[PDB]
Amino acid sequence: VNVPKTRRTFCKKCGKHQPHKVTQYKKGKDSLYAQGKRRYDRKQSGYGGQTKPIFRKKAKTTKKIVLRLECVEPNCRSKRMLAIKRCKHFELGGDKKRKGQVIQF
Amino acid sequence: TNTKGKRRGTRYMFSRPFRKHGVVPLATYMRIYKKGDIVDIKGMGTVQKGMPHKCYHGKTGRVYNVTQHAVGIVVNKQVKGKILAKRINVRIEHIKHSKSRDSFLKRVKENDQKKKEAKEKGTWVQLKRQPAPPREAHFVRTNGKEPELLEPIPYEFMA
Amino acid sequence: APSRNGMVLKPHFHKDWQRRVATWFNQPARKIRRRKARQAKARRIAPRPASGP
Amino acid sequence: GVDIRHNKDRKVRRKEPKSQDIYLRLLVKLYRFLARRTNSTFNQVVLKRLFMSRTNRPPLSLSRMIRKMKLPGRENKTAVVVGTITDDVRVQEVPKLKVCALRVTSRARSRILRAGGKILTFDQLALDSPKGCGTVLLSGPRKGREVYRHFGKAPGTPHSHTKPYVRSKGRKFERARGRRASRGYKN
RNA sequence: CGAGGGCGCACCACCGGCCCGUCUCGCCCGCCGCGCCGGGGAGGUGGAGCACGAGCGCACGUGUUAGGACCCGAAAGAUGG
RNA sequence: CGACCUGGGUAUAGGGGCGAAAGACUAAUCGAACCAUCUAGUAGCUGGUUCCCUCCGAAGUUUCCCUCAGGAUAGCUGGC
RNA sequence: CUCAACCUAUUCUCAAACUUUAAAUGGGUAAGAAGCCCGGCUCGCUGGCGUGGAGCCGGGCGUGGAAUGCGAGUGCCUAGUGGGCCACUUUUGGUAAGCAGAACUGGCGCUGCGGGAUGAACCGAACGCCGGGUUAAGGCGCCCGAUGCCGACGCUCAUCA
RNA sequence: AGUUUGACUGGGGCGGUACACCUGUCAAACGGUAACGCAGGUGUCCUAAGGCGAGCUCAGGGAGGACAGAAACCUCCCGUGGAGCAGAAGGGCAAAAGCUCGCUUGAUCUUGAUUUUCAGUACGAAUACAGACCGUGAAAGCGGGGCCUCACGAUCCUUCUGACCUUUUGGGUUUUAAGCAGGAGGUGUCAGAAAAGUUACCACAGGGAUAACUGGCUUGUGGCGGCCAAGCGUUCAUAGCGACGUCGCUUUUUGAUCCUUCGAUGUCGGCUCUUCCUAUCAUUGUGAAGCAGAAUUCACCAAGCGUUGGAUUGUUCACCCA
RNA sequence: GUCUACGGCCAUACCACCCUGAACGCGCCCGAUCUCGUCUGAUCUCGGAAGCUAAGCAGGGUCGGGCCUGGUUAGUACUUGGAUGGGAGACCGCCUGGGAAUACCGGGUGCUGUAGGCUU
Ligand SMILES: [Mg+2]
Ligand SMILES: [Mg+2]
Ligand SMILES: [Mg+2]
Ligand SMILES: [Mg+2]
Ligand SMILES: [Mg+2]
Ligand SMILES: [Mg+2]
Ligand SMILES: [Mg+2]
Ligand SMILES: [Mg+2]
Ligand SMILES: [Mg+2]
Ligand SMILES: [Mg+2]
Ligand SMILES: [Mg+2]
Ligand SMILES: [Mg+2]
Ligand SMILES: [Mg+2]
Ligand SMILES: [Mg+2]
Ligand SMILES: [Mg+2]
Ligand SMILES: [Mg+2]
Ligand SMILES: [Mg+2]
Ligand SMILES: [Mg+2]
Ligand SMILES: [Mg+2]
Ligand SMILES: [Mg+2]
Ligand SMILES: [Mg+2]
Ligand SMILES: [Mg+2]
Ligand SMILES: [Mg+2]
Ligand SMILES: [Mg+2]
Ligand SMILES: [Mg+2]
Ligand SMILES: [Mg+2]
Ligand SMILES: [Mg+2]
Ligand SMILES: [Mg+2]
Ligand SMILES: [Mg+2]
Ligand SMILES: [Mg+2]
Ligand SMILES: [Mg+2]
Ligand SMILES: [Mg+2]
Ligand SMILES: [Mg+2]
Ligand SMILES: [Mg+2]
Ligand SMILES: [Zn+2]
């Protein structure tokens, strides 16, 4: 799919439609001090081996793309997460498609 | 085994009649549906929005809610050993007024008028319907014409 | 196995509890013994208050 | 053979009290005779109530009795309850009441009597009104019990507001998955 | 005996009302702390709620469950000899 | 007449020993001895499950389950 | 001049995954008092309008508005079961099967009894302990109850009837 | 050293996925309805192929027009859709839902109700509303994704976003951490364990719910017959045969099934021995011939009597010698 | 008797060819300054009024096609329920009720609502 780098959509903070910059959300790095990570490290320390399941049975070949929208108002930099459907190839701000155009030889 | 698709087996059920495709006639949009009237859920296939499920095609219900384009219908559905009253939102293209209720209302109005008139005229009249009684005793004239003798025909091999 | 409506119960009987059961058949005897000891102590501290300081 | 079903032949109902209380059985004898030998339907209702169990004879509070006896046209009528009359400490003014009850709490009895009222047992009620004339037959709230909070549709079905059975109440006891949209679903 | 009429228990269906959470809208009020303070309203909606208590204790029955768990039954595993 | 047969004395002990090797032998037991204990181990599996009369009276189907010899669930049953 | 194609009007034969037409059996609803008809009030909804709709408050109407049968409503706790099989008819796979798989009703399982010599399911009929009477399905030479009727009309000879 | 090494399954394994879904049919004109039933499809694709408005008409054909021809473009006429609408199929659709333009981001922010599967649980998908903020159009309106039916995912953990929000334990400030609400990272065995073999050295609990041998149903296949008669038979259908077809029988073949047996019915062959069958090889008595005789062939009554000795091979079968 | 504007049902209204059309009307028609669109004032938009019913349109016609509605097909096909009916089967008959579709042969060829005109 292809989505433009900007869109005019509702901003919850302003309470109205505003322009938003659209980027692709990428998962942040693990904190190492989140409570689940702390519990996991305590559980793993010592003897006993692996104590939690390790998935290793992947079936999906795609992910749901998440668009990070940022309100372009300087007084309101409010962000949001928009999920679009699964797609193998995703492009941000690609070239628009044309109708009466010759296919390249 | 069978799929659970919402329109499985509706190939003829939601199809249009022969030479009755195209634009929906506008009297169907002009019908007035109030709360409490009885409607048959047909389910035409030209309009896909607000379409009833196939288990409600051919079922009759009572309107309980009216919106801009649809009505809410309380319609009985039988699920194994229980009948339970479902509430479904159906666009007005897929319903029409049931004429059984129209005929009954006509009969009630006739009965009330006849009772009010009969008390004034004095005598008594019959208001309940009755099942078709045994035929009365009557005479059959021959009109000087002998009844025609009927004889079974011989067998012949047609083709 | 759960059977219809009920309360999710968590009995703490997974730990060989039958070896550590404290019966109380010596409770009346203990009451008698403590009462007799109280009487003896009160006799021992003859004019001093029985309950203590 | 005949084509009938026999699974509803025996009607399930109290034909006598399950109680062995001899005073209750004596006044059951009394009201059995009254029901048989009078045409009053009050006696029949009272007898069938005497047969009933304790959960089918819920207590009647003083406040509820006063409220039902304050209704128009019930002045100088005998309030009859087949059960216990209970003091209600939420009321302050007790009017003059003529009352017939199977049991009366000691505080309720003292309040009624100091208000100038009168208390009768059911044998005294039979001697006073053998047909139940001039009575208001009251009943305590039959569904005012904790079990009726758990009765009904299961707690985990949509549009059910029935209490679940939990050993404890708190934020860790049956509040996460199936109770809020954040944890799976809510219904 | 009685056509009609009345007060209506419990319970049921429905409509209102109130309490806590959470949204939307909006104008007020309070003061030894004038605040990034406190209180209030209307309209939806979430609650195992209120709406003149029904519980507590004891006994009995049934059902489920943890325990040797209705009775008898492995191949095995562990500790110490 | 030999890598010969044999007595007694010694050494090696159980996941160990010993094996010119067959998983052989290790007190009639060996692809892990024997003894006691943990232990009445667990069993969705097999077998059994003790007096009388009266009344009512089924299911082998739905949905979910590493589910298919089992359960939960609805249905059908009885009692109050 | 001939043979093709093509067109036109006809002609033979078909369809579970074709169809103009289109049954039977079948599925829903209605057959009143919560109804019908009068007045009035409320609304922040709707709006040319005393509009529309809904709600509410009074009043009047009983020939109780098809047949037939039956007393209904409602709650709690709950065991067993969750291997099924058979028959008429419909029906899928298979050459077929006492095969495998569906639909409908009944049955066996859980069920004895009369008949089918015999037999889980077929036909009749379902059951407390008895006497009398009468039947069902089926029978009435003898086994073996009952034709030991002067039964009626025909057909048929089989050295595998 | 500890553990695991899925399920369904006309036994199991191998093979497939009938394991989560969608279309048509089965399906017996409401709905529902099975088999490792049939014909197929799915894990995507799309800033437009989403949303409005406007204007057009498609496939195909006919007749014409420089190069230009069976297909290049242009014009007229016919054209109920015989095209297209992303894909499987079905439904639907014509100043549409298709094609071309213009403007856009309703593919946005929220609370509930409902439908579908259904236990009337969830997920997914969907319908009708209500409250915001917007788009488009002159407007009526239409739009909170794709014309409809599929295109997907819990707890725990992580990550991001939001409230000058709550807590962070004697108080306060600040980091940090924990919460509340909404997205995402996934469990395809798709209501969601973290999982390789081998055992003939084997063990146990069981199973005739389930295979290998008998038996039973069946008879495709094997074997043995019949009917018709185009032909073969120097001629001549039928002495003897029998193509195309078609009707049977048999249970000495092999399949099919899984009813009995898994707290055991000893599983090949030979040897020994008895009996039975006839679909008769010989012998007795006959009939027919393309029966001159001899020999042979066909058929009938017929199972009384007989049907052998050996080489090779475990063989049953087979083949040869005699 | 008709038409125009907006329609309801959506062929008894459609399609092919022929004939007639008074009066209004509806059109064809004349032009591009403005409004507005085009390669093209052809369409669309706008300003008109010389001509014409040739066309659209209306009405009528056709042993017209279609469509609508009857008869026939036919109590046929199929079918609810029944039998210890028949038949080796395949299937068939009867009892009890219901009951079609072609071919073929007839008749018909728009009804109508609101508002406004013309028609002596
Ligand atoms: Mg849509
Ligand atoms: Mg002390
Ligand atoms: Mg019974
Ligand atoms: Mg309420
Ligand atoms: Mg219980
Ligand atoms: Mg035991
Ligand atoms: Mg272990
Ligand atoms: Mg070995
Ligand atoms: Mg043991
Ligand atoms: Mg699982
Ligand atoms: Mg078993
Ligand atoms: Mg079967
Ligand atoms: Mg059984
Ligand atoms: Mg039974
Ligand atoms: Mg029986
Ligand atoms: Mg018998
Ligand atoms: Mg027999
Ligand atoms: Mg008798
Ligand atoms: Mg006999
Ligand atoms: Mg005899
Ligand atoms: Mg014969
Ligand atoms: Mg059907
Ligand atoms: Mg159906
Ligand atoms: Mg358009
Ligand atoms: Mg909206
Ligand atoms: Mg699953
Ligand atoms: Mg078996
Ligand atoms: Mg053969
Ligand atoms: Mg010849
Ligand atoms: Mg043996
Ligand atoms: Mg033997
Ligand atoms: Mg012979
Ligand atoms: Mg014609
Ligand atoms: Mg018939
Ligand atoms: Zn903003």
Side-chain angles (χ1 to χ4, degrees), chain C residues 2-44:
Chain C
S3 191
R4 285 202 199 75
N5 204 2
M7 190 185 288
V8 171
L9 296 166
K10 295 220 195 280
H12 285 55
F13 295 111
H14 296 99
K15 218 201 268 192
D16 206 8
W17 59 276
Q18 281 178 118
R19 273 169 50 201
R20 302 168 303 279
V21 172
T23 47
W24 280 58
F25 305 123
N26 66 331
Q27 152 185 43
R30 185 205 312 284
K31 293 176 76 69
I32 291 170
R33 182 185 309 125
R34 287 169 167 173
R35 177 179 161 75
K36 278 200 301 185
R38 258 183 313 263
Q39 290 164 352
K41 182 195 56 210
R43 264 181 258 121
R44 213 184 65 242

Side-chain angles (χ1 to χ4, degrees), chain D residues 115-175:
Chain D
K118 177 172 213 187
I119 297 188
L120 321 172
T121 47
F122 268 102
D123 53 288
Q124 307 181 263
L125 180 74
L127 284 186
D128 168 71
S129 54
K131 292 209 191 191
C133 300
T135 69
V136 178
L137 187 44
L138 294 179
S139 186
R142 194 76 85 76
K143 272 204 165 93
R145 271 171 73 222
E146 164 86 349
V147 301
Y148 291 98
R149 284 169 207 256
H150 310 274
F151 296 164
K153 284 191 61 191
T157 59
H159 307 334
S160 77
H161 303 299
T162 71
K163 196 183 264 191
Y165 290 110
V166 293
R167 74 207 189 232
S168 306
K169 192 193 275 187
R171 62 97 180 172
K172 284 187 313 178
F173 305 102
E174 287 196 30
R175 291 209 197 279

